[PDB]
Design a protein around this ligand. Structure first.
Ligand SMILES: CC(C)C[C@H](N)C(=O)NS(=O)(=O)OC[C@H]1O[C@@H](n2cnc3c(N)ncnc32)[C@H](O)[C@@H]1O
Ligand SMILES: [Mn+2]
Ligand SMILES: [Zn+2]
Length: 771
RNA sequence: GCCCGCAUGGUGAAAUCGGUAAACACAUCGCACUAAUGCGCCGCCUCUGGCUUGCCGGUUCAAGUCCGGCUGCGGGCACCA
């Protein structure tokens, strides 16, 4: 009988008009910043988002009721591959597709009653965001954090773009699922390697992150310890430093072998063999038979001072150490050759390092971050290339460099490179005719710092230091573990960079990270367009209302565990919510007779009122603590316990205790089921919005009732329980316990040695052996 | 190979600190008012008693919880030198 199809909207408008969710930095309440991973604008809102975002809203609504000044914002991850591929697949320009998805997602969110501070909305594709990011790019470029280099990068032949190492998963492209290849090409990078030590060591301080996410990052960065041994070439200047962990076996080396892509290859079957390995996909390059080619030349071991053969082999992987190995048949080198140690490593490197012929080596798996993409739909790189002057920043006056409106979908090079009038630019140094950078920034550049932009999303400065340093770091960040070595690496990296450059005074973006579980279909399969099992949230919200949808997702299981979604699944929550409504409509006489919004000690005329009052106080405490640690399902169980309590014992309760309990019940329920809660609050005669009511606090007079159920152990084993008055003297407790028949029986041939009494919790009697 | 996480009834699961294991729901069954609603049973056994949080131990007055070792599942990095 709650008409959600008109009433949800009615309450949403009430909350809007009171500005409940508008973040005000000049508010005096203690600051709280809760956010969730902002969505790609690749389609409509899906049920998984609803789960992810419901959790943030529930928390935010509670923290608002508790007096915090809460920033809970939302915006749109709208550039790069995801939006762009979805727009291509549909047949529309990505600007038009993106805007439609924004508009659809924002509408779905508002209809769910999600309480975002919309004044803080942003979209990474808007000119205002582009201006900010281009400024940030040019700052990082001036300080040497961003640089151009002509080196090996991953290439996705189906996306037709370069990809970052983090966007290569199981040798495949992040979005295409196509085998990735490696090309040498001039590209833009960020020097994340130079921060790799801080990224790795500062994991120890992130106690609010899951140890799983932390360990996944530890392995991604992949710091290794070993030794570099320099190997001189005969009729030549420069050496080739090999890398090993088994330095101990240095004199044991029968050979040296190189990576096909190594700088120093400075002829028939060499350049033929190499280009044959270098043509292989990243997948193929790791598997199959081992191969190689004798260089011809030879090279020296400066311990032994004695000559060694040089080779070029496929089993040397280019992304580990120096790309030179140092072989001994280590059964990698044994298959190749057919075609008592620790303090030894100490003294060896002493000899080598003191006579400049080797050293201690720290290596990282982490590759520097490729950000340039040969794609239309991303942030232009604000660089002009001049045949005279080289790479030149666009002047701040010219910012932002916006995309041309028309996209050219066929031709050579990158899509922007085909647009001759867009590409034409004056060199800002000499004034000659020059060319814009033809590439765009990867989507993970946008999302690496967006959380620092929400506090003033239309400012001509990228980041408002003074606002940010008050509202951030974010207290709570909610999103999927799939970002563990994408956005959660990059965001930590860019936070440190911006810290060091003065934008902010904190070094880590997110205090507490929570990873919501997957929402799957009823059979446990990932939802996807290709399986035709994508839930439409609007259909479910239309049938059941927003509250029932959100409470099913929150009550179904632990926050971090998978849900197998059923479209009829919210029916049981809807039924629970109607049972709450009926408890109000049954007691409406009593409600309209008392203004009580909670229970006072003077309202309790007996032991039954005090049992009720007590249960409510526990429920306040438990709901409060559980929301803040994301135990939403246990919080909702506590409210259902109260609800059962009131069905069972209400009506024997004094009217005032019952009106207070019911009003208290709806106050606790509000963060979970906000619309129905406003309805019931109003129906009970309140004029205010419950969403604006201070959150309940434990009345410490009502927390213990008159009697306590105390379990009794003997030697740690539960025997029975005993009900006693609260504040019984410890000697009277013991004397009462020793009098229980079960206890008198079990001690009739045994001596009492000790007891452990934990007040109002337990008594364990420590007893000797059978006489 | 190297690193990490997890394990509780038919089912989803609960349990700040070590303190009555299974709260709260879903399913089936039963009861009361002719579907709705209210309400009840609902881990096991050789059942007056006694067990039970995958397995074996340790710590402690006390272990689902802490420590050690297994087994099983999940995840991460790797022709990783
Ligand atoms: C910060 C930025 C790099 C994020 C990036 N723009 C992005 O990932 N956008 S997004 O739309 O794919 O995801 C948004 C949020 O929604 C979660 N989610 C998605 N599907 C499900 C699901 N089936 N079940 C549970 N959660 C889901 C997902 O994990 C994430 O936190
Ligand atoms: Mn293995
Ligand atoms: Zn010039």
């Amino acid at each position: 009988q709650y008409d959600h199809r008109s009433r949800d909207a009615f309450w949403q408008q009430k909350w809007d008009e009171k500005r409940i969710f508008d973040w005000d930095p000049s508010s005096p309440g203690k600051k709280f910043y809760v956010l969730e991973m902002f969505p790609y604008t690749s389609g409509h809102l899906h049920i998984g988002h609803v789960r992810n975002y419901s959790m943030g809203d529930t928390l935010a609504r509670m923290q608002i009721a508790r007096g915090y000044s809460v920033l809970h914002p939302m915006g749109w991850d709208s550039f790069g591959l995801p939006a762009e591929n979805a727009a291509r697949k549909f047949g529309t320009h990505p600007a038009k597709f993106t805007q439609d998805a924004i508009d659809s997602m924002k509408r779905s969110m508002m209809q769910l009653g999600f309480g975002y501070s919309w004044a803080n909305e942003l979209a990474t594709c808007s000119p205002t965001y582009v201006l900010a990011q281009q400024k940030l790019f040019l700052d990082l470029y001036r300080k040497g954090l961003i640089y151009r280099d002509d080196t090996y990068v991953y290439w996705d032949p189906v996306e037709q773009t370069v990809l970052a190492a983090e966007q290569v998963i199981d040798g495949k492209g992040w979005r295409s699922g196509a085998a990735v290849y490696k090309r040498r090409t001039p590209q833009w990078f960020v020097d994340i390697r130079s921060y790799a030590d801080r990224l790795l060591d500062d994991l120890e301080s992130l106690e609010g992150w899951p140890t799983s996410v932390r360990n996944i990052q530890r392995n991604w960065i992949g710091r290794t310890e070993g030794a570099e041994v320099r190997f001189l070439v005969e009729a030549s200047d420069l050496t080739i430093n090999a890398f090993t962990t088994r330095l101990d076996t240095l004199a044991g080396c029968t050979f040296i072998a190189l990576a096909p892509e190594h700088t120093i290859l400075d002829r028939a079957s060499v350049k033929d063999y190499c280009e044959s390995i270098l043509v292989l996909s990243s997948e193929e390059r790791s598997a199959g038979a081992k191969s190689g080619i004798f260089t011809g030349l030879m090279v020296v071991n400066p311990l032994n001072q004695e000559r060694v053969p040089l080779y070029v082999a496929n089993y040397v992987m280019p992304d580990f150490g120096t790309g030179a190995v140092i072989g001994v048949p280590d059964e990698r080198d044994a298959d190749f050759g057919a075609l008592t140690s620790s303090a030894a490593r100490e003294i060896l490197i002493a000899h080598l390092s003191e006579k400049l012929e080797g050293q201690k080596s720290t290596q990282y798996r982490l590759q520097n971050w490729s950000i340039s993409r040969q794609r239309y739909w991303g942030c232009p790189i604000p660089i002009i290339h001049c045949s005279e002057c080289g790479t030149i920043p666009v002047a701040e006056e010219q910012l932002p460099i916006l995309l041309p409106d028309h996209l050219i979908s066929e031709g050579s090079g990158s899509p922007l490179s085909r647009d001759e009038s867009w590409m034409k630019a004056k060199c800002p140094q000499c004034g000659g005719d020059a060319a814009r950078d033809p590439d765009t920034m990867d989507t993970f550049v946008d999302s690496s710092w967006y959380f620092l932009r929400y506090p003033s999303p239309s400012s001509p400065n990228p980041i408002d230091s003074s606002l940010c340093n008050k509202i951030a770091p974010a207290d709570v960040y909610i999103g999927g573990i799939e970002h563990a070595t994408l956005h959660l690496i990059y965001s930590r990296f860019i936070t440190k960079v911006l810290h060091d450059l003065g934008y902010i005074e904190f070094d880590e973006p997110f205090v507490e990270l929570y990873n919501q579980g997957m929402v799957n279909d009823v059979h446990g399969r990932k939802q996807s367009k290709s399986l035709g099992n994508v839930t439409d949230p609007s259909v479910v919200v239309q049938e059941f209302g927003a509250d029932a949808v959100r409470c099913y997702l929150l009550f179904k299981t632990t926050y971090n565990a998978p849900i197998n979604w059923e479209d009829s699944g919210p029916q049981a929550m809807r039924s629970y919510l109607e049972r709450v409504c009926r408890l109000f409509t049954n007691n409406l006489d009593r409600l309209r007779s008392s203004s009580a919004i909670e229970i006072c000690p003077d309202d309790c005329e007996n032991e039954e009122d005090r049992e009720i009052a007590r249960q409510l106080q526990l429920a306040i405490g438990k709901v409060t603590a559980d929301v803040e640690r994301f135990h939403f399902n246990a919080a909702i169980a506590a409210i259902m316990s109260v609800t059962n309590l009131l069905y069972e014992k209400g009506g024997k309760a004094s009217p005032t205790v019952l009106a207070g309990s019911l009003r208290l019940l709806v106050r606790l329920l509000a963060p979970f089921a906000p619309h129905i809660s406003e309805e019931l609050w109003a129906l009970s005669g309140c004029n205010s919005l419950v969403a604006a009511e201070p959150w309940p606090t434990i009345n410490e007079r009502l927390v213990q009732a008159e009697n306590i159920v105390l379990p009794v152990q003997i030697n740690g084993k539960l025997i029975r329980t005993m009900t006693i008055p609260v504040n019984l003297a410890e000697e009277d407790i013991l004397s009462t316990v020793l009098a229980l028949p079960e206890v008198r029986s079990r001690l009739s041939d045994r001596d009492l040695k000790n007891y452990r009494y934990v007040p109002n919790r337990i008594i364990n009697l420590v007893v000797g052996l059978e006489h």
